[model samples]
Target: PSENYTWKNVRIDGGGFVPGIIFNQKEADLIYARTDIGGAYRWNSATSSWIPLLDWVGWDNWGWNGVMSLATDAADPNRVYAAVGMYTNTWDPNNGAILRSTDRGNTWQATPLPFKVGGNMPGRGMGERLAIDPNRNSIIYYGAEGGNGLWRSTDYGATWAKVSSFTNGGNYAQDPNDPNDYLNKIQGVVWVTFDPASGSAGNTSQVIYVGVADTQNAIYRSTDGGTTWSRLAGQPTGFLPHKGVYDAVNGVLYIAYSDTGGPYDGAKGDVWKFTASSGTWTNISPIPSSSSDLYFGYSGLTIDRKNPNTLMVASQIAWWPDAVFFRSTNGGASWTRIWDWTSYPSRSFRYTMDITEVPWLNFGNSNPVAPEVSPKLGWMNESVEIDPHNSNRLMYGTGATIYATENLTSWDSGGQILLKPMVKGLEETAVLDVVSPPVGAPVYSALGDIGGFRHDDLTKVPTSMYTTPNFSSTTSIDFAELQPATMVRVGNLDSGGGIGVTTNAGGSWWQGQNPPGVTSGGNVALAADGGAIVWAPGGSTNVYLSTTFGSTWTAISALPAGAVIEADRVNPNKFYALANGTFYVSTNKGASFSATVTAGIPAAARKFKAVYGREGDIWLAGGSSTTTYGLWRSTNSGASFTKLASVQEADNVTFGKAATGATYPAIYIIGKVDNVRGVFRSTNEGASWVRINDDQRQYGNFGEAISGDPRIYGRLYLGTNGRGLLYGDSA
Candidate 1:
C-alpha cells in the first residue's frame, strides 16, 4: 500500500466464478461481490463498477483468495466482514480466517479461526454462511463445513468460539465412500438466519434459525435467547436447504432447497415459506415437481430490500441450453421466468444477449453439445442479487462473468433489458501462460475455462474472445522467437487436439491441423523461426512438425512420448527435449533427435525453459525434490550445467532483459532462500538476490508459471492456478 509499489489486477473482464454478492440493507450503493478464488470486490458508486478489496492479501496467505461469505452490518453502516479461505483440502495447507473491515471495505484486519473453512469447496455456492446481527453490531454467526457446526463472534469477529450448546452438527456427506476426496466430504451447517424481531426492535437479535445439509430434521431454531434450541417440526426431507432469508417486516422465513449438496449437480429442488408465528410450512415452489422437463434445483435466494414481498431465486444448475431465473412479487404465490421458452435454433427465445462490455461471452463452448442455443446467458447461476435499495438494478454471476441489468423490471413487461457486463474494474481470469513479446501485443495470455486472449492494449479489454474453432480451456501457448506473430496453442479434450494459429499478432486466427490420430490434448511448441510441433504422450507421441502454420503435420519418431520440448531462442532449426534425465537436441527442424548433446539433466527436473534472447542459453529447475530441487543453468546448448546457490525450492524460472546496471538478464522465481518463500530477483546470476514482493503480495502456492518482461524494467508476471496472473514491477 505504499507509493513505491502498487499491484493492479490486469483487467480481462470476468473469467471466473462469483458465488456471493452482498448488499448493505441501510446504505445505498454499498455492496460487495465475493469470488471463489480471486478475492472480494466492493461496489464503487463513483464508477458504477467493483473495486477489489483483498488485493493486499499476498501469496503466502493466498488461501484468502476464496471468499465464501460476506456480511455487512446494518447497524454500523461502515462495518463489513468476509469469510476467507479457498479450500479445506490438502491443496490449501493453511486454515481460513474472518476478515474485518471497519471502513466498509477499504481496510481490513484478520481474525484466525481454529477450524478450516471450505470457501472453494463443492457446496460453496449453497449458503451465505456468514451473518452479522442487525440488532447487535458486535454479534456475528458463521455456518461451517465438514461437520464443524456453527461459530459465533461477540467482539465483532475479533475472536470466535463454537456455540457449545448448538450441538446439531448437521451431518450430511456429499459422498459416503470417498475417504480422501475433499469434495465428497461432509457438508455441515449450510445457512444461518437472524430474526431482527427476536429482541427489542432496536437491540439484539436473540432468535436464530439454522439450516443444515442433512435431509432429516435439517433445521434448528433458538428463540430463548440462544440458551436452548429445538428442531423445527413439519420440515421436508431428502434435500439440503441452500439459502434462508428472514423477511423482517412480514416476520416470515423463505428458504431455498436442492436435492443434493452442490455448486453443480442439483437436479431437484423447491422453495418453501415459513410463517414463524404459526409454525406452518408451505411449499410455494416455482417448479413443484422434480420430474419436470427442465430438471433443476433451487438455490441463491434474495428478497428485495425496499419491498420485502418482491423476491428472486435461481436454479442450482440449469446446464447446457440455458439456466433458470425466477421472480416473485407476492411472497411465492406466483413466479415469473427471466425468459419463457420458445422454439429452437434462432428466433424463438424472448431475451436479448447484450454483453456489449464483455462481448466474449458471445463465444464459448457450452457443454452437453447444445449448438441450438447460441449466446445462451450462462450456467452455474449460483448467485443472483437484486440491489436492496434499487430494485431496478439487479445482478447475477455465471461461470465466467458478472451480468447485471439496470432495467430489471422490464422482465415483467416483456421488454428488452440490456444485460451488460459489470466487470469494468473487476478482473478474475485464471492465467495459464503469459508470454511478453517485444513486438506484437504487450503479452499473449493462455487461460483456463474461457480460452486465451491477446492483449494488444494493456488497459483495454478485447472486443471479442478467441474464436474460429475456440477451446473450452487453453492449456499451453507459444510463439516464434524470430517470427513473434507466428504463434500456436493447445487445448483440452473437447478441443479435439486443438491447434490454433495466428500469423498477425492474434488480430485474426484460424483452426489449424493437428498430427494424425492425436485426439484429446498435448503440449504445443513452435520453432524459433516459424513452425508447429505438438507432443502428446500417446497418439502423437513423436515430435511432429508443421511448416505451413499448422496446416499439415508430420511426426519425427526419434522423439519419445511425454518429452518436454522447447524451441531454441535463436537457432530456427535447433529444438531441445528433456526426457529420462537426458537432453536430446534436433538440429534440423525436429525431423530427428540425438542424445549426443550432454546428458547431465536431473531425473526429477520439474520444468525446462529457455532464455528468449540467447541462442544456446537454457534453464531447468527441480520442483518436488527439495534436496535435488535447485536452478540449473546451461549456456552451451544444454551441454553443461551450473546450480544456482541460495535456492532451495524452485518452482519455475524466467529471464527478463538485463537489469538497468547489469548485463545478464534479470531472473524471477517462486524460490526459497534463508527458508523464506517469495519471488526473488537476481541480476548477478544468483551471486546476489533481492526479494521484491512484500508479504502482502504472494499470489498463491500454485504460481508455477513465471515470465519476466524484457521490455519493462523490474517487471515480472506469474501465472497462478485460480487467482489469475499477477504482476510486480518495482518502482
Candidate 2:
C-alpha cells in the first residue's frame, strides 16, 4: 500500500482591505475585495472562504497605494470603478486615475481623467473617493486631493468633465509670489456631494457642495445651480477641515474637518458639526473621548445610509488601539461602540478599517459538498513498451507493473529476467567487460558461483547493463535494507536542446542550453511539436529562437520595440510576436515576418506582457502607457486583435485540457493587482474568472510566476515573491 500525503493551504501575511470592495451581481453573495499588496479575492459564501482573483487578471507593477478607492453601480451591478494613485509613506504624491469594470468583477477597463500634473503628476494623496449616484445609475463623481478638482461622469464613467466651476471653494490656487509658497501646495478640489433625490444632473440646479484643505478650509454651498456661492464661515480655528459636506436623508448636513497650526504641523486633529443651518455655527458639545494619548485629528467620515443619524469616523491615532470607529445615534449628541480595538481579533496593533458598509445582510442556510480525495495516476510518469516479437517478454524502469492474463485483473510487481554478479579472479565481487555489439547486438557476459552454494558453478549471460544494474544491486542487499524514500531522479538533459527530458515524468528534470536571442530572467514559450521550440523576448525589443530544443540557439530577429513572442499552438513554424507597438506574424519558421496591425483597437502605446494560443487562435496580455490595458484575443492568428476582456493586470495565462476527451479548454490567469491574492481560473474563456487558491494558501509577497504543465492536466505550479514553489492538482 502507498502512503497518503495531504495537501496544505498557503498562508499569506501583510494583507489588509484598501481602495475597497468589488461585488459580483451574478454570484449575488460573492464580493471581491482589493488590498494594497496588488491582489483581489472573492468571498465564497457557500464554503466561507476567500479565494484569490489573480488568475483572471494579470500582474500589476505599482507598489503599495496603487488602488485608492473602489465603487460599484447599484443598478447594473456588473459595473464597478476604482481610483488608483501613488502616495508616499512620508508625504510625496504621484499621478492617479479612475478605472472601470463592466463584466461583473471578472474584468476591468480604465478611462483617463481630464487633468494630471507634477513629478508624480496630478498627485493623489490621503483624500480620494468615488460615489455612484443611487438615483441615477449612470451618474458618477470622483474626488481627488490634487489637481483636476471634482469630476462628474454622466455616461457611466466612459467620459468625465470638471465640475469645479460649480463650487465656490478656491480652485487649488495659492500665490507662487507669496513667501508662504507652502500654502500654494493646495490643489483644485478634495471632495464633492449632491442630493441623491435630484438624480443624474444633480448639479444642474447647483445644489452641490465642495470642500477644500486651506487656511480658509471652508465648506461652500451653491443653491442656484453653481452660478453663485456662499461661504459658511466661523469654523473653529484648530480644525484643518479634511473631508467634508456629507448630507444624509434628512435636511441635516454633516461636516468632518481636521486642523493643524501650519502645513507640516503634526499636532493636527479633528472637530465636527461646525455649522448646520446658514449664518449659525454650533460646536456640538460632549466631544467623543480619544482612543489614544496622541492629539491628531480624524481623517475619514461616513454616514450610515440605513440610519442617517448614525455616523462613522476614523481618528489619526497610531498607538495601541488608538484609532476607534465611533457611531453617534442622536446626531452627535452621544456615541455607541459598534466596532473598536477591543472588538477586533488582534488587540495590540492599531488597525484601521478605511471604510465599512452594512448592506442589508441576508441570512439563509444551505449545505455544501466537502472536498474529496481519490487515488489516481500521478503526473509526468514515464511510459514503457515491449518489443512486438516478444509478447511474453517485458521491460520496465526502476518501477513497473505487468499484466499476463487476458482480463488483466491480476498483476505482478517485477518480471522474471535477472542478472548475476561477476567475481574477478577470486576474492573480488564486481562486474567488468560486459559489452553489446552494434545493431542486432550480441551479448557477452559471465557469472561466478556463490559461497552459500558450497559448489563450483558457472552461468553464461547476455551483456545488457539495462537489466544488470538493478538485478545485481537487489541480490546483494535485502529489499528491507534500502532506506525509505519519497522522491527520485529519473532523467537527464538531451544532447541537442536546452529542454530537459524526464522518465519519472516532469516530477524531476535537468537543465538545457540557453535558447538563441533569449536573455536570462524573462519568460519562455514552448512549441507543441515533439522537438520543443522555445522562444524568449529580449528586455529591450529583441527575441531569441531555438529549434533544437534548448541546446543550440540563434537570434531570430529584432522584434518590434516592446514586442513579446507568442508560441504557436499546432506548428512550430507558425508563430506570433508583438513589437514596436504592433502585432506581427511569422509563418516560415521565424525566417521572415509580416506586420498585422488592426484598426479600432485602443491605439495608445502599450507593452505586451504575455501571449498564448494555438495556430489560428491566440490571446494577448498587455497594459497601456500609464493605465489599465488588459487581455486581447486573436481568433484568426495575429491578423487582428480584439479585446476579449480587461483585467487589473495579467502576468501569466494557461489553458486546461480535460482527460475526458473534452474539446473545449478552460483558461487560467495569475497576477497581483490590489492584494496578496493569486491564481484565478475561468472555465468559460475570458467571460468570467474565479479564484481557486484558498485564503490559507498564500502565494508569497505579491509578484510571482505561475505555470501549467502541459504534460499534466489539472495540475499547476506557482512561484511567489516571498514563498518558494507551490503546486496544485485538481485530482
lDDT of each: 0.77, 0.40
Tens-digit per-residue lDDT, 503-527, candidate 2: 2222233444554333222334444
Candidate 1: worst 10 consecutive residues by lDDT?
A: 365-374
In model 1, where do residues sit more than 4 Å from their true spots?
1-3, 178-180, 201-203, 343-353, 364-374, 493-496, 516-520, 532-534, 537-561, 579-584, 592-605, 624-626, 646-648, 660-662, 673-676
All-Cα superposition RMSD per candidate? 3.2, 24.8
Q: Give per-residue lDDT, candidate 2, residue 144.
A: 55
lDDT of 1 at 50: 80
Q: Which runs in model 2 stand beyond 4 Å of their true positions?
A: 1-9, 17-34, 37-65, 87-96, 114-128, 164-188, 198-206, 224-247, 259-267, 274-279, 285-294, 336-731
Give Cα distance to truth, residue 700, candidate 2, Å. 14
